[PDB]
């Protein structure tokens, strides 16, 4: 699984002391974040589980 | 990216926020998911 | 927006070399790889190479390999590019070019088109082939349907993309994917094709349509980008 976006962390100090870590800019190859699953693995281990049902 | 693929998704919020010196506010922003915000009643 | 702006332009004999600098702005620069394209007098485009800022790694012409250097600092959000023994194949103006967004249902390189294009700067020493467009020039009035053809020496993964240019300005792409609009481009604009032969089609001309039309074949590797000579859309 794949979260493909480099951004930053623009903190902004909402104290007093203690500081809060806001979402900066987002940037990179901006796609949906996604799970990749081999195919016939599934479709293999599926009908195992298949023939026990 | 235009046209729209991502759908959007975050939202490029702002608002008075209260800093360390407590008194003076600061106009700050920052991205949130629209899983994590609701709109109340820009908007 | 996007930007991508170029150093300045330089005479060379064969034999000669010379580096050329492309700083970004508009974008996280790292995020996108970086194409290095050239496009010779009276001649078509040619693909050096391309590097990508994030992990650094970089992909080059069977040609270029030996005699080129990309080079990224993302401080400064500039790329470099420097070509040693200069050779006929070497003049043209030299343009660095962003990549796309990843799309949807892309498998990979398939974003390898030049989404974003500097103006270029002009290097020049003695000459450069490949696909085949017509009509050389097409002379309509604004309302007329413009159809442009593109033969290929060689067969395409579907990765053929149309780019517009008014000369002196950066070139702008126009479809991708054989027939993928790009972002900001009208309806009107369509493409299609495959094999060696593809087209781009203007249903209804509008004024600032009048460019120069390019084709383009790109893939992942070194030899797979490969441009058309361009037909030139004038208004009459």
């Known amino acids: 699984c794949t979260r493909p976006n480099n951004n930053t962390r623009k903190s902004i100090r909402i104290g007093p002391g203690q500081a809060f870590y806001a979402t900066g800019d987002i940037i990179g190859d901006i796609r949906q974040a996604h799970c990749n699953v081999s195919k016939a693995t599934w479709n293999e281990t599926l009908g195992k589980v298949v023939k026990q049902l | 990216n235009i046209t729209d693929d991502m759908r959007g998704e975050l939202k490029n919020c702002s608002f008075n926020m209260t800093t360390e010196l407590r008194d003076k506010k600061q106009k700050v922003y920052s991205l949130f998911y629209r899983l994590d915000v609701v709109q109340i009643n820009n908007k | 927006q996007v930007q991508l702006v170029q150093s300045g332009a330089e005479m060379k004999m064969p034999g000669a070399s010379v580096k050329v600098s492309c700083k970004a702005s508009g974008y996280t620069f790292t995020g996108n790889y970086i194409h290095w394209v050239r496009q010779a007098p009276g001649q078509g485009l040619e693909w050096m190479g391309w590097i990508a800022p994030h992990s650094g790694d970089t992909s080059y012409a069977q040609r270029f390999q030996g005699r080129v250097t990309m080079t990224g600092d993302t401080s400064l959000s500039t790329a470099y590019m420097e070509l040693s023994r200069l050779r006929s194949d070497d003049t043209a103006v030299y343009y660095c070019?962003?990549?796309?967004?990843?799309?949807?249902?892309?498998?990979?390189?398939?974003?390898?088109?030049?989404?974003?294009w500097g103006q270029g700067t002009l290097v020049s020493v003695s000459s450069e082939i490949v696909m085949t467009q017509s009509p050389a020039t097409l002379s309509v009035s604004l309302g007329e349907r413009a159809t442009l053809s593109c033969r290929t020496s060689?067969?395409?993964?579907?990765?053929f993309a149309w780019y517009q240019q008014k000369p002196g300005q950066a070139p702008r792409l126009l479809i991708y994917?054989?027939?993928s609009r790009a972002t900001g481009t009208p309806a009107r604009f369509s493409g299609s094709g495959f094999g060696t032969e593809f087209t781009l089609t203007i249903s209804s001309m509008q004024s600032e349509d009048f460019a120069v039309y390019y084709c383009?074949?790109?893939?992942?590797?070194?030899?797979?980008?490969?441009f058309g000579p361009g037909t030139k859309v004038h208004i009459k």
């Open positions: 383009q074949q790109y893939n992942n590797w070194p030899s797979p980008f490969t």
């Open positions: 060689q067969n395409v993964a579907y990765n």
């Open positions: 070019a962003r990549g796309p967004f990843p799309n949807y249902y892309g498998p990979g390189s398939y974003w390898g088109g030049l989404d974003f």
């Open positions: 994917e054989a027939s």
